[PDB]
Amino acid sequence: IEEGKLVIWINGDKGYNGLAEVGKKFEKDTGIKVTVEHPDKLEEKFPQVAATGDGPDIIFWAHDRFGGYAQSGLLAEITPDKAFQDKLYPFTWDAVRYNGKLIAYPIAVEALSLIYNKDLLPNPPKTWEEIPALDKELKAKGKSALMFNLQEPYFTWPLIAADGGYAFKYENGKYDIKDVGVDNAGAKAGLTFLVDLIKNKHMNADTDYSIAEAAFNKGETAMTINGPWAWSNIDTSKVNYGVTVLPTFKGQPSKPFVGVLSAGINAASPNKELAKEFLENYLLTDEGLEAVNKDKPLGAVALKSYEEELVKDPRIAATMENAQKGEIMPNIPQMSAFWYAVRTAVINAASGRQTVDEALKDAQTRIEAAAKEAAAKEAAAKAADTQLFNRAVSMVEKNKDIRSLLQCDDGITGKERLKAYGELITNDKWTRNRPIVSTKKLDKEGRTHHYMRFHVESKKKIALVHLEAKESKQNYQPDFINMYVDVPGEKRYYLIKL
């Protein structure tokens, strides 16, 4: 990655010519060249090139893919101040957090809405419960009330979640991956309502994306559930349509999954401050987003000032309302198990191959099984820190010069047993437990650097040890490249220098 310029990757269905115009304005004002590219499979290539210290400085993609990048240490923690954060809707910041850290800037927000035919239905239903009666009325006119894709859980989840289903619990700013909400009472109630619509012939278990789109766009059904990617085909159909809040179920909003197009900074980039400057001062502004939107519509946006302009279009207002009431898509890898399992559950419940309770219990079990590891990854990460600490403690306590600085009680009867432990303030947080931890950065070459501090104590002195270790390409264990000890009243002592 070249220092003093920015390279940006974004998908080829986005407004990349518009983004390139924001880049040319940045360059006009600052002298810094901005190059926008839209390589195919950028989301698969990114983690491969970033790990070698290559790739773009900034990547734009749906927020949920960034959890895996962050787990791999490939995204830099971003540093917007609180004034900047207050310029975006607060829920959007929840979509770009991993391990308690902000790892991308939210740009736009997408979610399913209720799309309705204003000529058949000028007053669409506020509740799911009223849809059976409305269908009876529309059936008498040779129409139906509602058709939408029943094959895919992304489309059926909004109803299943409404009364309390959820993929994984989000609480205290993070996911509890072992806390899955697929076979709880809320999910059962929503899926039973869906299956009852099918049993009562208000919907057909075979309806899929194409069949529902064709019925709505031909004026055969009064409503569908779909997202903003579908609006252009309806425009061509000339159906007189509106877009509105999804119906409530048991008095609770339907909860569609929310996707937040976000901009992440490559952890290996030598241009992190330039990327922040571009993103905060040029892109996430009314003028910057307008330029992107004019090329290809962003939909609803995270930036309050520009969203307040876009909602002149009530369809955009509806996307945002549904998104604010929705479930942010989780950014953790066990969602692959969620999709696989809930897809079978909903198909089987809708076909009658299983009951709702059996279908959802089987799904819940499969997801929990998938979630049983993942402890393992953070456990292994912690054990890597414990190994760095134990190696460093051994080096320090074997060093004659450091023992002397610590005024160790050593002599013919024995050597003093030193204690070692972490700090009371760790990453600016009160930690009475004195934890052993490192922080990580990626260098220009994509190699991981680990930074750790800990105390060593003799009866006479308590010192602070600092170390930096660098990932090895030959060995599992990293190499120490810097290590020093500050003993009060003494000169800093380097065990390893540079």
Side-chain angles (χ1 to χ4, degrees), residues 71-112:
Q71 182 58 50
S72 297
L74 304 177
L75 258 10
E77 174 171 14
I78 63 159
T79 58
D81 67 16
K82 206 120 79 163
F84 188 88
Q85 297 171 42
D86 291 342
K87 288 167 102 161
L88 279 62
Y89 294 99
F91 81 110
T92 67
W93 291 112
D94 288 321
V96 293
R97 291 187 182 274
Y98 194 86
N99 285 330
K101 294 185 178 81
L102 295 175
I103 48 71
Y105 289 86
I107 307 300
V109 172
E110 184 172 75
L112 290 171

Side-chain angles (χ1 to χ4, degrees), residues 290-409:
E290 182 174 53
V292 178
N293 192 76
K294 176 179 185 327
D295 180 5
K296 170 72 103 175
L298 282 166
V301 299
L303 184 74
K304 292 175 185 174
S305 56
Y306 190 48
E307 178 69 0
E308 292 159 6
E309 192 84 78
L310 290 175
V311 299
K312 167 206 196 168
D313 183 349
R315 303 174 297 163
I316 297 291
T319 300
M320 178 62 85
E321 180 176 354
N322 284 313
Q324 287 171 322
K325 291 174 172 171
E327 176 171 355
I328 290 170
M329 214 185 277
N331 60 359
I332 53 154
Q334 291 79 17
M335 284 298 292
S336 56
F338 177 91
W339 298 120
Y340 180 87
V342 175
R343 183 180 295 113
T344 300
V346 178
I347 281 166
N348 282 2
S351 72
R353 184 171 174 93
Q354 298 182 279
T355 62
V356 165
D357 289 353
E358 300 164 347
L360 289 174
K361 177 234 101 59
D362 287 348
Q364 176 88 12
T365 297
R366 189 176 286 276
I367 307 168
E368 284 174 345
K372 194 129 201 79
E373 179 147 80
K377 264 177 204 55
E378 65 150 72
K382 289 165 185 296
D385 282 338
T386 294
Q387 186 205 173
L388 283 176
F389 167 69
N390 285 339
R391 285 167 66 195
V393 162
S394 176
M395 291 167 67
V396 165
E397 79 190 348
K398 291 177 158 317
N399 186 286
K400 190 175 192 295
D401 288 343
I402 295 171
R403 299 186 71 81
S404 301
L405 290 180
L406 289 171
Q407 301 175 30
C408 283
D409 173 10

Side-chain angles (χ1 to χ4, degrees), residues 405 485-494 497:
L405 290 180
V485 187
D486 289 342
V487 175
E490 310 288 345
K491 198 265 140 183
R492 172 169 294 176
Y493 185 99
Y494 284 87
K497 199 167 192 161

Side-chain angles (χ1 to χ4, degrees), residues 197-460:
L197 288 174
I198 297 169
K199 290 181 173 170
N200 294 322
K201 307 177 148 67
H202 304 306
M203 301 195 310
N204 182 313
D206 295 321
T207 298
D208 65 6
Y209 190 97
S210 299
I211 287 175
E213 180 174 48
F216 187 80
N217 292 5
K218 284 153 64 180
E220 295 171 358
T221 188
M223 295 179 278
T224 187
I225 288 169
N226 220 329
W229 57 81
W231 295 350
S232 67
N233 280 347
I234 314 176
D235 287 341
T236 298
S237 78
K238 286 84 208 176
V239 166
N240 181 24
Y241 74 100
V243 184
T244 194
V245 62
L246 287 160
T248 56
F249 175 56
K250 302 174 72 190
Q252 299 260 57
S254 291
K255 297 187 67 188
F257 280 121
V258 181
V260 181
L261 175 66
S262 295
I265 291 176
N266 186 332
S269 174
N271 305 298
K272 301 188 184 65
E273 287 297 325
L274 280 172
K276 174 181 179 181
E277 187 183 350
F278 177 75
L279 293 167
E280 293 187 13
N281 302 336
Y282 284 74
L283 178 64
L284 281 166
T285 61
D286 295 345
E287 297 80 5
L289 296 179
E290 182 174 53
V292 178
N293 192 76
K294 176 179 185 327
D295 180 5
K296 170 72 103 175
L298 282 166
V301 299
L303 184 74
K304 292 175 185 174
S305 56
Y306 190 48
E307 178 69 0
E308 292 159 6
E309 192 84 78
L310 290 175
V311 299
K312 167 206 196 168
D313 183 349
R315 303 174 297 163
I316 297 291
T319 300
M320 178 62 85
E321 180 176 354
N322 284 313
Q324 287 171 322
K325 291 174 172 171
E327 176 171 355
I328 290 170
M329 214 185 277
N331 60 359
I332 53 154
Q334 291 79 17
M335 284 298 292
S336 56
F338 177 91
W339 298 120
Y340 180 87
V342 175
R343 183 180 295 113
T344 300
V346 178
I347 281 166
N348 282 2
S351 72
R353 184 171 174 93
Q354 298 182 279
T355 62
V356 165
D357 289 353
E358 300 164 347
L360 289 174
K361 177 234 101 59
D362 287 348
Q364 176 88 12
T365 297
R366 189 176 286 276
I367 307 168
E368 284 174 345
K372 194 129 201 79
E373 179 147 80
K377 264 177 204 55
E378 65 150 72
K382 289 165 185 296
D385 282 338
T386 294
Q387 186 205 173
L388 283 176
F389 167 69
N390 285 339
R391 285 167 66 195
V393 162
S394 176
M395 291 167 67
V396 165
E397 79 190 348
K398 291 177 158 317
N399 186 286
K400 190 175 192 295
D401 288 343
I402 295 171
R403 299 186 71 81
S404 301
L405 290 180
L406 289 171
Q407 301 175 30
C408 283
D409 173 10
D410 293 346
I412 196 161
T413 60
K415 279 146 92 168
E416 185 172 351
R417 295 159 300 179
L418 298 175
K419 297 185 173 59
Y421 44 73
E423 297 184 274
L424 296 169
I425 301 295
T426 303
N427 183 33
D428 301 315
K429 193 101 173 330
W430 166 248
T431 50
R432 180 64 185 100
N433 50 311
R434 294 186 172 280
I436 295 307
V437 69
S438 61
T439 55
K440 290 83 163 62
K441 296 192 195 145
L442 261 200
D443 59 28
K444 331 300 138 331
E445 292 82 56
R447 262 139 80 69
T448 295
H449 294 238
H450 310 260
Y451 305 86
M452 171 179 287
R453 292 148 59 106
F454 59 91
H455 295 285
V456 175
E457 173 168 24
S458 69
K459 291 181 281 174
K460 285 168 177 312

